[PDB]
């Protein structure tokens, strides 16, 4: 039942990371298209990246929502590590931010909506990201988002009732200030980080910058940013009530069947959250 290389033909690299390649292929059998990444097993050893690989395949194998990377298959061989993904033909929402520069208000309001649901859905599994930036927030050919990069996520047991986890992972424009300073993350910590992305989706660029991650790790503990002129004020609003320091009291904590009171800020008035997936998103220009 176990898929083997031979079974695609493979194409066009789609990307690179330091430890993998991902590559467009055709299942011969089917003509479906995946991205396929790949992993040099003895690569992966030598970097202690073993049980990276294994948890990305883990966390992966329990989702099943329109708003994330499909995992479809995995499959070795004496040398390699594969990974068959739904294809994200249009990329990362970073690429998008880059050459506009910025979003407005419909389409930051959209984006963020389909990234609030997205976030209900793993959080209602227990399962933390906790590396949520805009090169992990993928396009598919509708337009619509699809998260990947699920090797540093984390699944909260339920069996002890796990709020925190204790690896430190992430990227440092987002990473949260309780990791920085209580060394744990947890559920808030990826509010904190969508808090970044939609101040990011505004203004142009993520709110703690600096050319040294230690410089943006004071400011995070600082809270220390500001907002540029014209920035849309419910969207300013929504930001201040996600970048808030003490991770209880960011919006959405407030019980945790949903992110119901986030949904209701008035930022996404207009939103009609039940069917995000089957709407035709707004032009980005
Ligand atoms: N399902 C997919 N569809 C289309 N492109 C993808 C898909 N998954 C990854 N990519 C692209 O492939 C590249 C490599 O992704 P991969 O997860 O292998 O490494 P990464 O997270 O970018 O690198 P690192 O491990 O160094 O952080 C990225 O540019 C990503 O945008
Ligand atoms: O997790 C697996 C194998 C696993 C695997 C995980 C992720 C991607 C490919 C294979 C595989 C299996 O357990 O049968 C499978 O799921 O088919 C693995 C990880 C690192 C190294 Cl160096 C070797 C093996
Ligand atoms: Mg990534
Ligand atoms: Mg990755």
């Known amino acids: 039942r176990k898929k083997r ?3 695609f033909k493979f194409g066009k690299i789609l990307g690179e990371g330091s430890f993998s390649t991902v590559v467009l292929a055709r299942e011969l059998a089917t003509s479906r298209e995946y991205a396929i990444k790949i992993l ?4 992966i050893i030598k970097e202690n990246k073993v049980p990276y690989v294994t948890r990305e395949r883990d966390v992966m194998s329990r989702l099943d929502h329109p708003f994330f990377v499909k995992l479809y298959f995995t499959f070795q061989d004496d040398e390699k590590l594969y990974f068959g993904l739904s ?3 249009n990329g990362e929402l970073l690429k998008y931010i880059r050459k506009i520069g910025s979003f407005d208000e419909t389409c930051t309001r ?3 909506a389909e990234i609030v649901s997205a976030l209900e859905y793993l959080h209602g599994k227990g399962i933390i990201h906790r590396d949520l930036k805009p090169e992990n927030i993928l396009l598919n050919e509708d337009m619509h988002i699809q998260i990947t990069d699920f090797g540093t996520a984390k699944v909260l047991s339920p069996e002890s009732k796990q709020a925190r ?6 990227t440092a424009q987002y990473v949260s200030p309780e990791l920085l300073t209580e060394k744990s993350a947890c559920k808030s910590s990826d509010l904190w980080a969508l808090g970044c992305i939609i101040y990011q989706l505004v203004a142009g660029l993520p709110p703690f910058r600096a050319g040294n991650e230690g410089l ?3 400011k995070i503990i600082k809270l220390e940013y500001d907002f540029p002129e014209k920035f849309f004020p419910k969207a300013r609003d929504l930001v ?3 970048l808030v320091l003490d991770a209880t009291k960011r919006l959405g904590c407030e019980e945790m069947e949903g992110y119901g009171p986030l949904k209701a800020h008035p930022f996404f008035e207009s939103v009609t959250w039940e069917n995000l997936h089957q709407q035709t998103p707004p032009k980005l220009t």
């Open 5 to 7: 290389p031979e079974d």
């Open 40 to 43: 040099e097993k003895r690569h």
């Open 87 to 89: 294809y994200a033909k």
């Open 110 to 112: 959209f984006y963020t």
């Open 165 to 170: 986890a204790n690896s430190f992972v992430g």
């Open 216 to 218: 943006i790790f004071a």
């Open 240 to 242: 201040e009530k996600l």
